[PDB]
Design a binder for this molecule. Structure first.
Ligand SMILES: [Ca+2]
Ligand SMILES: [Ca+2]
Ligand SMILES: [Ca+2]
Ligand SMILES: [Ca+2]
Ligand SMILES: [Ca+2]
Ligand SMILES: [Ca+2]
Ligand SMILES: [Ca+2]
Ligand code: NA
Ligand code: NA
Lengths: 223, 176, 223
C-alpha cells in the first residue's frame, strides 16, 4: 500500500496473507474455511496466515493453515487478467474470534465515489521498494468506469473497476494482490493490477467481486 | 527511475536502434557482466562471466504506452543483444527447477524458440545504495503480486542466477 | 521481416512455411518435391505449406504436404551455423501453377550491391513482438564481405553473406529463418541468423546457396 497508514493490529480481521517462502499475496476470509484472493496469486503448496499484524514476528493471534483447495475462476485469462478471482479452501476451519473474522460478500455493486478500505503488506513506495512489517491501510474511492477505461484504454473489462486517485500518491502495490477492497462492510474488490503504483492517471485496478457472488456460493457448496 | 552506472536513467527499447546495457555484479572486488552458458536448443543459463569478460548487452522492453525509462518496481522483458539463429529469441525467463552441480534451483534462462513466446518479467528493486539493484522475477507485467528475488548459485565453479540463492546485486552499464 | 511491405497474395510463389502446430520457419520450393530451408529449422514431422498469403486461414489456394525427408547438411554446425542449409523432400509432389512455383538455383554467386527480395512471416517489430497474417517482403542489397565480417568479427564463414542496411530499420527477423533471398530470379540466400532485428551495424546473415548447388543436386539424386 502506497500513501496509506498503519492499520493497527487486528483492526482488519478478515485480512489474510498467502505464503510460500515469503508473503506474496493477500486474501480475504469470507467464512471460516474459504479465502477469496486473486487468480494470478495461484500457487501449488500455499499456506494461509490469519490474524497477523507484524508478519515478521509471532505476536500470538496468528493461525497458519494450509490451503487444501485452490479454485481459479474457470474463465480466468492470465494475459488480460479478466476474471482475476480465486477461492482458497483451508485445510481446517479457522478459529473465528475478534482478530480472525470473515468479511461479507456484496449484495449489490458499489457505485462511483464509494469510499473503500484497501489493505495489504505490499510495497509502500511508488519510487522504489519498501516492504512493511505491519499491515498498511488505504481509504480510496471507486472511480467512474469512464475515467478508469480512459486510464487503461482497451484493457478494462466489466469484471474490473478502478479505485484510488487520478492525481496519484495513494494506491495498492506489488504484494497487495489478492487483498481486500472493502466498502461499507462488503468485499467489493480484489487487488489485481495497475501501471506501476500511485502514478498520475494510473489508478489501481480491482476484481469486481459483485460479479462473482453467485459463482463463489456454488463453488463453496460443491467443494 | 532506475539509473545506470553513470547516474543516467536506464532507457527502454521503444523501437529503432534500442539502447543497450550490460548487467554487472556490484559486489566489491569484481563483477564480470551477465552472459550466457549454453543449456539446450535456443536456451542458455544466465550466469556471471569471469572478470574482464565482457557481459552481453541487454535490451529492456515493456508493453505499449509505457514511458521510455525503466521505473523502480516495474516489470520488463530482458533480452540479450547477441547473434542468434532466427528461430530463437533471447528473452530471459524463470526456468523449471533442476539439479546441477549438486545444486537444486530454478535458474534464470535466456532464449527459446521464438514461437513459444516464453519470457518472464523482471523487476529492478532498490538497495541502500543508489544505482545498485536487486532483480526480481515475475510471471506477469502489471499484476500486484510480490515477486521472488533473484540470487546467485555456485554451480561447478560458475556463478549462475536463479530464484532465491545468495544475495546478488547489480548495476546497469551502458553498451557501445 | 521488419521495415518491409506486404508482398501481395501469391506474388512470391516459391515461399513456403514449415509447420509443427506453429509456423516456425520459411523455405523455398526448388522443385515439385524439394524445399530448401535452414538446417536450424530441422524438426521431425514437418508440414510444409504452399500457396499461402494469410497463414492464419485456409485460403483454398493452399497446399499442405508432409516432409518425408528432412536432410540437414552433413557439415552443419549448430554453434557457428556454418552450413546452415537443409533439404526437405515432400511426401507427394506439389501441384504447381501460378501460385506455387519453384525458384531456380543460382548458376553462379551474386556480387556485393546486388538487389534481393527477402520474404517471410516473421516478426515485424524490433521492439516487442508482432507476427503478420500476410507474407512480408523486403528488398535489400547484398553487402561487401568487408563490411559483413566487420559487423560480426570472426563469425562469418565463406558460406555466409550479409544483406540489408548498415543504418538499420530494414531486416529479416525471428520467424523468417529458412526463408528465401532471391536475387534476379535466383535463390542466393537462406535466412539464417543475425544480432537483433534491424539494428544499426547488424545486418542479417544468409546461407550462401551458390556454395551448395552441387550438394543440393547430389542429395536430390540420392533420395
Ligand atoms: Ca482502521
Ligand atoms: Ca502479502
Ligand atoms: Ca459465505
Ligand atoms: Ca495446493
Ligand atoms: Ca450464504
Ligand atoms: Ca516497434
Ligand atoms: Ca519426419
Ligand atoms: Na452490498
Ligand atoms: Na497499461
Amino acid at each position: 500500500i502506497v500513501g496509506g497508514y498503519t492499520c493497527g493490529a487486528n483492526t482488519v480481521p478478515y485480512q489474510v496473507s498467502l505464503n510460500s517462502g515469503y508473503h506474496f499475496c493477500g486474501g480475504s476470509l469470507i467464512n471460516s474455511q474459504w479465502v477469496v484472493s486473486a487468480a494470478h496469486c495461484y500457487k501449488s503448496g500455499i499456506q494461509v496466515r490469519l490474524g497477523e499484524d507484524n508478519i515478521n514476528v509471532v505476536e500470538g493471534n496468528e493461525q497458519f493453515i494450509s490451503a487444501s483447495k485452490s479454485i481459479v475462476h474457470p474463465s480466468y485469462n492470465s494475459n488480460t487478467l479478466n476474471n482475476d478471482i480465486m477461492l482458497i479452501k483451508l485445510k481446517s476451519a479457522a478459529s473465528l474470534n475478534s482478530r480472525v473474522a470473515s468479511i461479507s460478500l456484496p449484495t449489490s455493486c458499489a457505485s462511483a465515489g464509494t469510499q473503500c478500505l484497501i489493505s495489504g503488506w505490499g510495497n509502500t513506495k511508488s519510487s522504489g521498494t519498501s516492504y512493511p512489517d505491519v499491515l498498511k491501510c488505504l481509504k480510496a474511492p471507486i472511480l467512474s468506469d469512464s475515467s478508469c477505461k480512459s486510464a487503461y484504454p482497451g484493457q478494462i473489462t466489466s469484471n474490473m473497476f478502478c479505485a484510488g486517485y487520478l492525481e496519484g500518491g495513494k494506491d495498492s502495490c506489488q504484494g497487495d494482490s489478492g487483498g481486500p477492497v472493502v466498502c461499507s462492510g462488503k468485499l467489493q474488490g480484489i487487488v489485481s493490477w495497475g501501471s506501476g503504483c500511485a502514478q498520475k492517471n494510473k489508478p489501481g485496478v480491482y476484481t469486481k467481486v459483485c460479479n462473482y457472488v453467485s459463482w463463489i456460493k456454488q463453488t463453496i457448496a460443491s467443494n | 527511475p532506475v539509473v545506470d552506472s553513470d547516474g543516467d536513467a536506464v532507457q527502454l527499447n521503444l523501437g529503432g536502434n534500442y539502447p543497450l546495457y550490460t548487467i554487472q555484479s556490484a559486489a566489491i572486488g569484481f563483477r564480470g557482466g551477465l552472459s550466457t552458458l549454453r543449456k539446450d536448443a535456443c536456451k542458455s543459463y544466465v550466469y556471471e562471466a569471469p572478470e574482464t569478460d565482457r557481459g552481453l548487452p541487454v535490451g529492456f522492453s515493456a508493453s505499449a504506452t509505457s514511458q521510455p525509462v525503466m521505473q523502480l518496481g516495474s516489470r520488463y522483458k530482458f533480452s540479450f543483444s547477441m547473434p542468434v539463429p532466427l528461430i530463437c529469441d533471447t528473452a530471459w525467463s524463470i526456468g523449471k527447477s533442476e539439479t546441477n552441480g549438486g545444486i537444486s534451483f530454478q535458474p534464470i534462462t535466456a532464449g527459446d524458440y521464438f514461437y513459444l513466446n516464453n519470457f518472464s518479467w523482471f523487476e529492478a528493486r532498490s538497495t541502500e545504495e543508489t544505482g545498485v539493484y536487486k532483480l526480481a522475477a515475475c510471471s506477469c507485467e502489471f499484476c500486484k503480486i510480490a515477486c521472488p528475488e533473484v540470487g546467485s548459485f555456485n554451480v561447478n565453479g560458475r556463478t549462475l542466477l536463479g530464484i532465491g540463492g545468495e544475495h546478488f546485486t547489480v548495476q546497469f552499464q551502458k553498451f557501445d
